[PDB]
Amino acid sequence: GVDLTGISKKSRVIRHHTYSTNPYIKLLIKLYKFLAKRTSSGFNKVVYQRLIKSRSNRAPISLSRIAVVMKRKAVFTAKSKAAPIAVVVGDVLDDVRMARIPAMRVCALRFSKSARQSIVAAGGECLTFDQLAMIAPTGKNTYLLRGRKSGRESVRHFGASGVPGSHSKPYATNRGKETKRGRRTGRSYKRKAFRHV
Amino acid sequence: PTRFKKCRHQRGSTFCGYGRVGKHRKHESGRGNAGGMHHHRINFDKYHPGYFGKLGMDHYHRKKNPMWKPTINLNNLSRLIAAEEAAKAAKGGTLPVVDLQSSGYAKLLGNGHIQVPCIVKARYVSKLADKKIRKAGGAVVLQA
Amino acid sequence: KRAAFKQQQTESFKKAVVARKAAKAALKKTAYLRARKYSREYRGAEKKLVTLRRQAASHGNYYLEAKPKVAVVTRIRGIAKVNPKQRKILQLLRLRQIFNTVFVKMNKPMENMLRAVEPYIAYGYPSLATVRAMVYKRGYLKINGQRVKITDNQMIKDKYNNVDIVCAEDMVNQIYTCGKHFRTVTHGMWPFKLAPPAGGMRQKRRHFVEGGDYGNRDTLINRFLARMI
Amino acid sequence: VKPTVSKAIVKKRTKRFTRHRYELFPQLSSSWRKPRGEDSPVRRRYKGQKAMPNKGYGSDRATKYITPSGFRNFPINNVEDLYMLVMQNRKYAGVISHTVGARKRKAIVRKAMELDVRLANGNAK
Amino acid sequence: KNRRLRLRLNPYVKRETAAAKGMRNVANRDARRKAKLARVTKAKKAATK
Amino acid sequence: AKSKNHTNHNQSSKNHRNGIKGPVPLHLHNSKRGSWLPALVNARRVRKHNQKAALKKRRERIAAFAAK
Amino acid sequence: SHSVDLQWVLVRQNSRFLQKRGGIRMSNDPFNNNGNWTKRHCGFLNEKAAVVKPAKGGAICVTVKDGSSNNKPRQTYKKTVHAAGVRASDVSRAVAAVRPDLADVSFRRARRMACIASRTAKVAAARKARSEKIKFSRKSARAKR
Amino acid sequence: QTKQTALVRVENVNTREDATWYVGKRVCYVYHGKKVKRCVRWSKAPARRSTTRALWGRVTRPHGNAGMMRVKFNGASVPASAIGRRIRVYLYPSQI
RNA sequence: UGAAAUGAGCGGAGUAUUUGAGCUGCGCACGGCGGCCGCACGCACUGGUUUCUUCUCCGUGAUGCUCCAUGUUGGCGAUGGAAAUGGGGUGCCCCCACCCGUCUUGAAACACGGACCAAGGAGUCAAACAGACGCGCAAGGGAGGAGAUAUGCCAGUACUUCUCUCGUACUGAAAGGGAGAUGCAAAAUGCAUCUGUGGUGUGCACACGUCAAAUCCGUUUGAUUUGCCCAACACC
RNA sequence: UGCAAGGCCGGAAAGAAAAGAAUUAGAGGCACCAAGUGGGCCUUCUUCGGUAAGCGGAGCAGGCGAUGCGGAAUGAACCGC
RNA sequence: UAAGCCCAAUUAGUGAUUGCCCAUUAUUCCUUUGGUAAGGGCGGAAACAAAGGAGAAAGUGUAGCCCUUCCGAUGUAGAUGUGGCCUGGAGGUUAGGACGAAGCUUAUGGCGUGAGCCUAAGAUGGACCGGCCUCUAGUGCAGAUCUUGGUUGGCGUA
Ligand SMILES: [K+]
Ligand SMILES: [Mg+2]
Ligand SMILES: [Mg+2]
Ligand SMILES: [Mg+2]
Ligand SMILES: [Mg+2]
Ligand SMILES: [Mg+2]
Ligand SMILES: [Mg+2]
Ligand SMILES: [Mg+2]
Ligand SMILES: [Mg+2]
Ligand SMILES: [Mg+2]
Ligand SMILES: [Mg+2]
Ligand SMILES: [Mg+2]
Ligand SMILES: [Mg+2]
Ligand SMILES: [Mg+2]
Ligand SMILES: [Mg+2]
Ligand SMILES: [Mg+2]
Ligand SMILES: [Mg+2]
Ligand SMILES: [Mg+2]
Ligand SMILES: [Mg+2]
Ligand SMILES: [Mg+2]
Ligand SMILES: [Mg+2]
Ligand code: NA
């Protein structure tokens, strides 16, 4: 026998195949598993890992965030060079708060219809991942992008709301209930807004 | 469906995941929300602060229709304009008209930067919304 | 016949074979010179020690030997009923199994670590023969996290990618003289996995000084390991 | 047809794993059941008790499912089923289903003899 | 113990074995024994004086 | 009946099962909330000025890059 | 519009050609040279396909899917050799024109068909002699028109 | 006990050195059944047909210090009804 | 059993190179007494010699992706009331071997339930909420009820939506208010502009270089600089 | 121009020498959702109450419980593993 | 003249430093299975009929695409996975049956680690029913002083 105390602690849970039933996601996973094995690109590797991920972990992105980050990159980029292709393994959603966007090349798993319309009407084009594999087989001159997940309602509800320094939302159907003892100084006590970590 | 549940996996395990020592007994904590101040106090206090006690004024015979007051911000006004109209709109020119109450809105709030100048007919408008839309070439017209 | 890509591959592979044969011949020549140099160094060092001892003895003086720099430590107990401190030390020594064996530097930190786990180990000072026997017969490398038997010098050279470690005798010399790459070489090896001593032990529960087996037994560790290797 | 040759079949264990103490109760079948009794001497692995099945008893991948004749049994029901066996006829033998009647069996055996497709339960000669 | 492997790892092993064989030669051994004893005794007697 | 009230016997084993996690580095979570108020107020003024200087510096950097 | 990749993803687990019997996955697809259930051997699926079949007598027939009329099932498959005594390598080259990745298996299948035809001749002759020894109380004659 | 290895005591073999001499030699256990079954040279030499049977093995190593030898029988363990019965140790395969 | 014999072992060539042992040169180290001695065969000159002791030098990619198939000598086996091997059955031998289920710190227990067999026999359905995972659409999603007409066979499917709901805003006990950035400035509702991360630290990819290693010389695999930094975290 | 604090601009960094001058079967962080437990008992050292107990109560650590195998004839916990 | 106690050896003042016997341990070999697994191959290489063969799937999971390599493998309560087993019905798709379906019987073999599957034989039966994908549920028994029916030793006894 060999002393391996809690060696099971070092094993890590990693998705190695997709739970998706979508046949086209499976075709894309085939393509990019081949590209990640047979090329030196880090872009292909990360695209493959994201392709096998769960939908919750492929957060959607807004068109406005894409435009803003592409602008921050466009300055300090030589005006000789062309703008990178923005790549998101996920969904692109339209944004009503940004009417005026530049011509952008975007590759996404899916576009919302209004997002696709806005991108095209601004002069850009909507790509799929097979076209991207055709014209950027190693992901040269690309901008890999992720959507936001920290504003999610589930994230806002995580953790006990009655411990000092917590500001999580409680699981409650009635907003007016649970506004008393424990939340006001005049009702016995109030849970502290701040605690030093 | 029945074939996917833990009961199928437990056929032959005798205890079905509830243990030999602590059994699966009937109501070992009491029923429902019993003992929220006695023996469930920590659960209630750490996950549902504010649950016990009273607060504020009563309002007998609350009618929600007289209180109907939905809001929309300045940077969302383009949701209520036809696609061709938002383009023929410009400061100093002929502007589209938005009537809020027929779109389901009572108050123009005024968060963000307005995207399409327009004339907005609102029952209510915040002071910042009014000033901000006037600076952009639009206007607010009160309605009832 | 074979298309363009097949002919590309055959040209490239022919060049690969030629380059591999040249690399093998060069590595063999290098290993030969280094082994000759090390053999002469060992013989000369022992002869100088002999002369120093003779000169000290001839005038009523003494020759204090240099403190041994390297210890060879083998675990001699199973994995049951080990207290937390001893468990942690044996894990840091990579002695996770009975008759697992390692080389350590015999400095103050390692010395106190060895003292703390005295009843679990048997250790001493390895001769050159012992180091050679362990590397050649029981030597394995950590290659890609896999325990791989040493079978040629190309595996050693590829593993270490360092000019001073390209052959078996380079590792033997680094281990034996506590060279500047001692940690690199020993850390790059899998812990040695030995058989029980043929002929048996005396008493694993008593110190070697008491007629048992678990102490520091100085150079008699070489007899022990000879029966084990 | 001769089957393709494989290495020696080992068959790690030829005894069946039978249920604990089924020899004593007529209603208990010998089908294996993992003993879960807290004091069970079989579950606790006392030396003289029955063994329990586990992964280390699994057959060599290379000789698994190979019948003593050297073929792998493929169930067939028809004359037309033999055609997918016609190409890999040194690897797979055909087993005529038990419910296939004697008349259709006559036809199947004639065609299989013609095709050189081995049948596990055909005619003796 | 295996010959191909020992020579593959240490190409120089043939020469160490040749040296060991030369050392185990009874004529060479006896001559060395005589010469070494005489030489070391001469060195000792020279140093002691 | 009468039974055992207290023991710490298995507790350090449990605590070490997932180990005693070490402390957070000092450069993380170094909130100044609740510290001496005058110094806090002065430091806030300096921080506002430094944010303005960062904005101007980025604007100047953009202009100088666009010059090339 | 819809690739062989997608169609293979769609039909791999479930198809009227997949014969999963015991634990063995064979295929009774007519355009499968092997009976193996792989995307390579699915002649019914692939855009271009070729299968070696037996013909009347000692002839060997090659059926070819050239992919030009895949939307027309009656025209999809074409008989192209139907020749007797062809070299197995000739069948192999006829198959390799549409699918070089099927060359080896189709060569072997040509040889197997030749062997089967000769063997059937021998078995039939022996059975005929045995039959000529027997009285055979009943004999059915198909109506002719 | 582990029945795959039998222990044999040979007359006049009373040291580990003698048992070493016998290492590798063929070993035979002769008995009889009830019926006459197939033997070697059943067709060539029908006078060999007998209820008599033999089980063969080889000495693998000595056992202890006093001349006992370990024996491996071909394929199957020797029957326990042979305990205390005669065993033949032949002089072949020979080394002299 | 040569269906890759990778070799000091196979096949070719040479009678030599060189590694110890010897006894020797110059210093330098090394030991006494303070440069004079010695020097045990230490280091460098890979010194000289060779008195004796070794053998040394070349060679085979895979145009093999995988698996399976090749010797010698007898015995038995020549188509049968058969020879083999495996499986199955019963007895015997030598070793092993406490009664299951359960509660319990602890059961073979003088702890309880346990004559046999058949059939029957226990985590279900509904509602509310949450998390994970699948699917559609997305700043919007979706009904429900009900109508319409294919529709007079058909409790299904196809179609509609006026609304309704929960989300795009949340704060205050309420009266009631209600969130962009940059710039200038500092007006108790301040002006202008708007293609834009509020700032800072840490931070994928990618883009510029730069190293080290390995290279079949094409490349690739680790790190690192600078820029932007996506997600995210921490301070503002 | 000193002290404090936040930044910016640079320089230097055996990336930690030498003196016994570490070692690692040495990827750190961050979450989410749940089970069973919440009668213990034994041993080693340290012990408190008790004349004492196979008694009662604690500290540290290994165990049995949940675990057989080899050994002490036999034994949950001893030795070995 | 221990087969007892204390001490000390390993074939004995000879010429050196392993007497011997037993583990689910150690070392090593073979096989399985699972990884926080590690690498290769996968553009059919060229030719090749009967009187060297076959295979080669871009793949979590299968009879696992195929090959190589390393490491781990026990476990109550408990958690989770499984092209894991099984049963009654439904939508599909493929079959079988009077030349004998279901059921039932077994020194009745074969396959699987196993749940089980499949064949054979009925000197059984008499009319329905198997496989595969998906859907669905009143879906798996050894014990509850368990329910109902039948049997049973005690017993040719009291
Ligand atoms: K594996
Ligand atoms: Mg409970
Ligand atoms: Mg002992
Ligand atoms: Mg002890
Ligand atoms: Mg079996
Ligand atoms: Mg127990
Ligand atoms: Mg308690
Ligand atoms: Mg009780
Ligand atoms: Mg009790
Ligand atoms: Mg019990
Ligand atoms: Mg009792
Ligand atoms: Mg009770
Ligand atoms: Mg829990
Ligand atoms: Mg318990
Ligand atoms: Mg015992
Ligand atoms: Mg393994
Ligand atoms: Mg297990
Ligand atoms: Mg359990
Ligand atoms: Mg039902
Ligand atoms: Mg039921
Ligand atoms: Mg049970
Ligand atoms: Na029953």
Owner of token pair 């029988």: H73
> CA torsion D63→D68→D73→D76, rounded to 10°?
170
H or E segment at H53?
strand H52-63
Residue B74 near residue B82 (C-beta atoms within 8 A): no
Judge residue A103's burial from the number of C-beta atoms within 10 Å of its C-beta, 0-12 exposed, 13-18 middle, 19 or more buried.
exposed
Cα–Cα distance measured from residue D117 to residue D93, given in angstroms and rounded to the nearest whole number: 7
Question: Which amino acid would we find at residue C69?
Answer: K
Residue G49 near residue G99 (C-beta atoms within 8 A): yes
The residues pairing with D94 across neighbouring beta strands, listed in sequence order, are D74, D119
Closest CA to C75 of C109, C137, C113, C119: C119
Give the β-pairing of B71-72 and B107-108.
parallel
Q: C-chain residues within 8 Å CB-CB of E5?
A: 136, 151
Residue B48 near residue B42 (C-beta atoms within 8 A): no
Resolution for this experimental structure (Å): 2.4
Q: HEC states along A58-125?
A: CCCEEHHHHHHHHHHHHCCCCCCCCCCEEEEEEEEECCCCCCCCCCCEEEEEEECHHHHHHHHHCCCE
The residues pairing with D76 across neighbouring beta strands, listed in sequence order, are D96
Cα–Cα distance measured from residue C25 to residue C151, given in angstroms and rounded to the nearest whole number: 16
Other beta carbons less than 10 A from residue G124's beta carbon = 11
Would you call B125 helix, strand, or coil by DSSP?
strand
Closest CA to C116 of C108, C124, C105, C128: C108
Cα–Cα distance measured from residue D98 to residue C166, given in angstroms and rounded to the nearest whole number: 68
Any CB–CB contact under 8 A between D38 and chain B?
Answer: yes
- Which tokens sit at D113? 């003899």
Task: State phi, psi for C167 to the nearest 5 degrees.
Answer: -145, 175
Closest CA to D113 of G110, G128, G124: G124
Task: State phi, psi for H81 to the nearest 5 degrees.
Answer: -70, -10
Q: Which ligand is nearest to the CA of C196?
A: 3
Closest CA to C202 of C189, C177, C220, C181: C220
Judge residue F54's burial from the number of C-beta atoms within 10 Å of its C-beta, 0-12 exposed, 13-18 middle, 19 or more buried.
exposed
Would you call H27 helix, strand, or coil by DSSP?
strand
H or E segment at E33?
helix E26-48
Nearest protein residue to nucleotide K114 (CA to C1' distance) is D53
Distance C18 CA to I16 C1' (A): 29
Cα–Cα distance measured from residue C43 to residue C37, given in angstroms and rounded to the nearest whole number: 10
Residue G33 near residue G54 (C-beta atoms within 8 A): no
H or E segment at E29?
helix E26-48
Mark residues 16-55 of chain D whose C-beta is closer than 7 A to nucleic acid strand J.
38, 43-47
Owner of token pair 């491996």: H72
Question: In terms of CA atoms, which chain A residue is nearest residue G3?
Answer: A27
Q: A-chain residues within 8 Å CB-CB of F31?
A: 194, 196-197
Other beta carbons less than 10 A from residue E33's beta carbon = 10
Q: Which residues contact A184 (CB under 8 A, 6 or more apart)?
A: A190, B50, B55
Q: Which residues contact D33 (CB under 8 A, 6 or more apart)?
A: B12, D19, D20
- Which tokens sit at A45? 């590797």
Residue G80 near residue G94 (C-beta atoms within 8 A): yes
Judge residue A26's burial from the number of C-beta atoms within 10 Å of its C-beta, 0-12 exposed, 13-18 middle, 19 or more buried.
middle
Residue E36 near residue E42 (C-beta atoms within 8 A): no
- List the single residue in G34, G108, G123 with the smallest CB-CB distance to D114: G123
Mark residues 32-51 of chain A whose C-beta is closer than 7 A to nucleic acid strand K.
33-34, 37-38
Contacts 24+ apart (CB under 8 A), B89-93: B89/B116, B89/B117, B89/B118, B90/B117, B90/B137, B91/B117, B91/B136, B91/B137, B92/B137
Give the β-pairing of B71-72 and G59-65.
unpaired
Q: What are the Cα distances from residue C227, in Å, to C98, C196, G25?
A: 15, 8, 56
- Which tokens sit at A122? 């601004």
Q: HEC states along F3-20?
A: CCCCCCCCHHHHHHHCCC
Owner of token pair 């002649």: G43
Residue C166 near residue C27 (C-beta atoms within 8 A): yes
Q: Which of F14, F21, F24, F31 to mutate to test the interface with A (most CBs of A within 10 A)?
A: F31
Distance B2 CA to I167 C1' (A): 34
Owner of token pair 């290659």: C143
Would you call A183 helix, strand, or coil by DSSP?
strand
Question: In terms of CA atoms, which chain G residue is nearest residue A31?
Answer: G5
Q: HEC states along chain D?
A: CCCCCCCCCCCCCCCCCCCCCHHHCCCCCCCCCCCCCCCCCCCCCCCCCCCCCCHHHCCCCCCCCCCCCCCEEEEECCCCCHHHHCCCCCCEEEEECCCCCHHHHHHHHHHHHHHCCCECCCCCC
Technique used by the depositors = cryo-EM
Owner of token pair 């050159």: C128
Q: Phi-psi bin for D45: left (phi > 0), alpha (psi -120 to 50), beta?
A: left
Closest CA to C180 of C69, C35, C37: C69
Give the β-pairing of C70-75 and C100-105.
antiparallel
Taken in order C13, C14, C15, C16, the sign of the CA dihedral is positive
Q: C-chain residues within 8 Å CB-CB of E17?
A: none
Q: Which residues contact A98 (CB under 8 A, 6 or more apart)?
A: A63, A64, A67, B115
Q: Are E12 and C31 inside 8 Å of each other by CB?
A: yes
Cα–Cα distance measured from residue A136 to residue A47, given in angstroms and rounded to the nearest whole number: 13
Residue A59 near residue A26 (C-beta atoms within 8 A): no
Task: State phi, psi for C56 to the nearest 5 degrees.
Answer: -65, -45
- Which tokens sit at C221? 């560790």
Q: What are the Cα distances from residue C53, in Å, to A163, E33, G25?
A: 76, 20, 81
Q: Which residues contact B25 (CB under 8 A, 6 or more apart)?
A: none
Task: State phi, psi for G57 to the nearest 5 degrees.
Answer: 85, -145
Q: What are the Cα distances from residue C52, in Å, to C49, C68, C100?
A: 5, 17, 37
Cα–Cα distance measured from residue D18 to residue C77, given in angstroms and rounded to the nearest whole number: 39
Q: Which residues contact A125 (CB under 8 A, 6 or more apart)?
A: A105, A106, A119
The rounded Cα H38 to chain-centroid distance in angstroms is: 20
CA angle, C181 then C182 then C188, to 5°: 90
Other beta carbons less than 10 A from residue H47's beta carbon = 6
Cα–Cα distance measured from residue G26 to residue G28, given in angstroms and rounded to the nearest whole number: 7
Would you call B141 helix, strand, or coil by DSSP?
strand
Cα–Cα distance measured from residue A117 to residue B30, given in angstroms and rounded to the nearest whole number: 58
Any CB–CB contact under 8 A between B57 and chain A?
Answer: no
The residues pairing with G61 across neighbouring beta strands, listed in sequence order, are G53
Judge residue B9's burial from the number of C-beta atoms within 10 Å of its C-beta, 0-12 exposed, 13-18 middle, 19 or more buried.
exposed
Kindly determine whether the C-beta of residue F40 is less than 7 Å away from any atom of nucleic acid strand J: no
Q: What share of chain H is helix, strand, coil (3-state, %, to 5)?
A: 10, 30, 55
Residue B87 near residue A118 (C-beta atoms within 8 A): no
Residues 3-22 of A with CB under 8 A from C: 3-5
> CA torsion F57→F61→F64→F66, rounded to 10°?
-140
Task: State phi, psi for C71 to the nearest 5 degrees.
Answer: -115, 145
> CA torsion B95→B100→B103→B106, rounded to 10°?
160
Would you call H71 helix, strand, or coil by DSSP?
strand
CB pairs < 8 Å spanning A and C: 16
Cα–Cα distance measured from residue C11 to residue C32, given in angstroms and rounded to the nearest whole number: 32
Q: Which residues contact G1 (CB under 8 A, 6 or more apart)?
A: none
Mark residues 113-132 of chain G whose C-beta is closer than 7 A to nucleic acid strand K.
114-115, 118
Other beta carbons less than 10 A from residue G33's beta carbon = 26
Residue C170 near residue C186 (C-beta atoms within 8 A): no
Q: Which of G25, G26, G51, G118 to mutate to test the interface with D (most CBs of D within 10 A)?
A: G26
- Which tokens sit at E31? 């001559």
Would you call A35 helix, strand, or coil by DSSP?
helix
H or E segment at H7?
strand H6-8
Residue A125 near residue A108 (C-beta atoms within 8 A): no
Cα–Cα distance measured from residue C130 to residue C228, given in angstroms and rounded to the nearest whole number: 11
Cα–Cα distance measured from residue G44 to residue G39, given in angstroms and rounded to the nearest whole number: 10
Closest CA to A157 of A173, A174, A175, A169: A169
- Which tokens sit at G89? 């390598």
Q: HEC states along chain G?
A: CCCHHHHHHHHCCCCCCEEEECCEEEECCCCCCCCECCCCCCCCCCCCEEEEEECCCCEEEEEEECCCCCCCHHHHCEECCCEECCCHHHHHHHHHCCCHHHHHHHHHHHHHHHHHHHHHHHHHHHHHHHHHCCCCCCCCCCCCC
Q: Which ligand is nearest to the CA of D17?
A: 5
Closest CA to H53 of H70, H34, H76: H34
Report the interhelical angle of C108-116 vs C84-92 (nearest 10°). 140
Would you call H69 helix, strand, or coil by DSSP?
strand
CB pairs < 8 Å spanning A and G: 9
- Which tokens sit at G13? 């687990």
| Residue-by-residue DSSP string for chain C | ---HHHHHHHHHHHHHHHHHHHHHHHHHHHHHHHHHHHHHHHHHHHHHHHHHHHHHHTTT---PPPPP-EEEEEE-S-SSS--HHHHHHHHHTT--BTTEEEEEE-SHHHHHHHHHTGGGEEEE---HHHHHHHHHHH-EEEETTEEEE--SHHHHHHHH-BTTB-SHHHHHHHHHTT-TTHHHHHHTBPPEE-PPPTT--S-TTS-GGGTSSSSB-GGGHHHHHHHH-
Nearest protein residue to nucleotide K102 (CA to C1' distance) is D99
Q: Which nucleotides of I are covered by protein (CB under 7 A)?
A: 6-9, 18-23, 30-32, 38-44, 46, 52-56, 58-63, 67-69, 74-77, 83-84, 86-88, 92-105, 107-109, 116-118, 123-125, 128-140, 168-170, 173-174, 177-183, 189-200, 204-207, 213-221, 227-236
Q: Which residues contact D83 (CB under 8 A, 6 or more apart)?
A: D115, G28, G35
Residue B82 near residue B89 (C-beta atoms within 8 A): no
C-alpha of residue D39 to centroid of ligand 10, in Å? 5
C-alpha of residue B20 to centroid of ligand 12, in Å? 15
> CA torsion A27→A33→A35→A41, rounded to 10°?
140
Would you call B81 helix, strand, or coil by DSSP?
coil
Question: Which amino acid would we find at residue A176?
Answer: G
Query: How far separated are the first and last CA of chain H, in Å rounded?
Result: 35
Report the interhelical angle of G103-132 vs G88-96 (nearest 10°). 140
The rounded Cα C167 to chain-centroid distance in angstroms is: 13
**Is B17 a known ligand-binding residue?**
yes
Residues 21-40 of A with CB under 8 A from G: 23-24, 26-27, 30
Residue ranges of chain B whose CB lies within 8 Å of a chain D CB: 12-14, 20
Residue B116 near residue A99 (C-beta atoms within 8 A): yes
Residue A139 near residue A43 (C-beta atoms within 8 A): yes
Closest CA to C185 of C174, C197, C169, C199: C174
Cα–Cα distance measured from residue H34 to residue H54, given in angstroms and rounded to the nearest whole number: 14
